[PDB]
Amino acid sequence: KLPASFDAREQWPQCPTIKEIRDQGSCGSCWAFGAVEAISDRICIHTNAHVSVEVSAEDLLTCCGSMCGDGCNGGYPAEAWNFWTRKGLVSGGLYESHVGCRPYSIPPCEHHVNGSRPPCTGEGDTPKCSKICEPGYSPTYKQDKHYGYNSYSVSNSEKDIMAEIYKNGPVEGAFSVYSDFLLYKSGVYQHVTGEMMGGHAIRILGWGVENGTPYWLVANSWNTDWGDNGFFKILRGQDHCGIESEVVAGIPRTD
Numbered sequence: 001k002l003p004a005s006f007d008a009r010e011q012w013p014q015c016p017t018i019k020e021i022r023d024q025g026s027c028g029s030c031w032a033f034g035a036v037e038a039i040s041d042r043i044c045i046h047t048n049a050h051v052s053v054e055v056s057a058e059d060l061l062t063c064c065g066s067m068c069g070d071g072c073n074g075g076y077p078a079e080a081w082n083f084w085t086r087k088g089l090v091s092g093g094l095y096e097s098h099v100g101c102r103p104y105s106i107p108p109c110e111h112h113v114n115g116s117r118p119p120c121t122g123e124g125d126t127p128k129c130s131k132i133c134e135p136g137y138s139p140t141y142k143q144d145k146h147y148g149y150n151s152y153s154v155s156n157s158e159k160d161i162m163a164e165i166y167k168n169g170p171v172e173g174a175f176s177v178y179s180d181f182l183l184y185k186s187g188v189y190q191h192v193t194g195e196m197m198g199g200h201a202i203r204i205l206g207w208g209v210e211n212g213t214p215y216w217l218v219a220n221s222w223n224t225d226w227g228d229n230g231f232f233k234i235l236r237g238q239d240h241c242g243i244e245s246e247v248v249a250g251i252p253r254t255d
């Protein structure tokens with residue numbers, strides 16, 4: 001039933017957020033980024049491109065509080081999606097973009113690569129929850145909220161995750177980062193060297209096969225000069241680095 005390859009960017013060509021790579025900056029907010037990116041995609045898919053917006057990482061990062069975790073010091077993706085169902089999320093684009101209600105306040109940086117931006121440092125402070133949109137944006141904060149119908153776990157099964165993406169759009173997942181992952185440029189990632197650095201949340205938007213190796217198509221939040229234009233591929237079908245073990249998703253309410 002499922003195709004040998006699937007790419008959400010090809011399936012939903014009128015949904016620009018699916019193609020977009022963000023930059024979490026010097027802040028451990030991957031849990032938030034994986035969520036708002038997939039939510040942005042799912043709102044566009046759910047409306048057949050009639051509503052296409054960058055959902056605010058700032059809003060999720062700053063305003064969830066204890067139920068999600070500890071802001072820039074890590075969080076729980078499951079409860080990020082739950083926050084979307086309970087209190088909703090406003091719009092917000094990239095740093096100094098002036099796009100949406102609450103654009104990201106933490107500046108971009110170079111994540112384990114050379115480039116013109118400053119080098120990323122450790123976990124910076126979590127910004128305050130400010131329930132007010134930026135100057136120049138309409139409508140108001142309350143009026144700009146987008147809500148989810150539900151949030152749920154996807155089972156630790158390759159085919160179930162594929163089915164979920166195929167039907168309902170990109171999902172959030174998490175995997176264990178080893179030091180060799182940081183150097184990723186292209187191909188299918190499999191862990192071959194290096195120690196455990198910690199967990200990392202990302203957006204899964206498809207799958208395929210390359211030179212006989214099955215993979216998941218993943219968006220990272222380390223800007224576009226990391227990896228393969230901000231994306232990477234990782235081995236699919238063996239719960240590699242736990243990539244199939246913490247997938248989470250949710251369906252939008254209609255605005």
Ligand SMILES: *C(N)[C@H](CCCNC(N)=O)NC(=O)C1(C(=O)N[C@H](C)c2ccsc2)CCC1
Nearest residue numbers: 028029030031069074075122123174199200201
């Ligand atoms: C994502 N960037 C974040 C790593 C931040 C570490 N920064 C750094 N300088 O090393 N990781 C996460 O958000 C996850 C996590 O580890 N959460 C922990 C277990 C947590 C859960 C509840 S409170 C803290 C990995 C996916 C979630």
